[PDB]
Amino acid sequence: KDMLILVDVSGSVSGLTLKLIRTSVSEMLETLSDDDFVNVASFNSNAQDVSCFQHLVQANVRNKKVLKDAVNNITAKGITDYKKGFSFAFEQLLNYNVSR
Amino acid sequence: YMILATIIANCIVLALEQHLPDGDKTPMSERLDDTEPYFIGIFCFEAGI
Ligand SMILES: *[C@@H]1O[C@H](CO)[C@@H](O)[C@H](O)[C@H]1NC(C)=O
Ligand SMILES: *[C@@H]1O[C@H](CO)[C@@H](O)[C@H](O)[C@H]1NC(C)=O
Ligand SMILES: [Ca+2]
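ok -> structure tokens follow
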């Protein structure tokens, strides 16, 4: 795969929804092998990386842990924007400078 | 009766709002927020009369 998990951390996902989203992203990462490349983005009127990674990184144990920590440390606030988020996703899947 | 009509209009606008937790807001709440100046103007004009 070449995943890119867009997490919608806007205002309307506070409470139980954010709990389920972070657990779901953890359990989604737990299905990626070492041949798979994944990054996690998050958008609320502005799309950003959840972690220190700026591109698609290999889904090995260390990188998966870093992404899981970043997703667990995430908070919900602000208005949604499905265009600035999918633009970020489609741009990060158009990066060919990195290993993939 | 026109003042009455704007009162029921304002009541429906108030009842049409929806609230989201952390500063999120619905795509239609912006329109409901833009419709306020007409109501405040009509009320001020009535008060002036
Ligand atoms: C990560 O966790 C620390 C400690 O709880 C917090 O200060 C920081 O704001 C978190 N990161 C983000 C992006 O919120
Ligand atoms: C990749 O490298 C090229 C040239 O080195 C650069 O113009 C571009 O901004 C880099 N990033 C992406 C996502 O293409
Ligand atoms: Ca929302």
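The longest helix of chain A spans residues 16-29.
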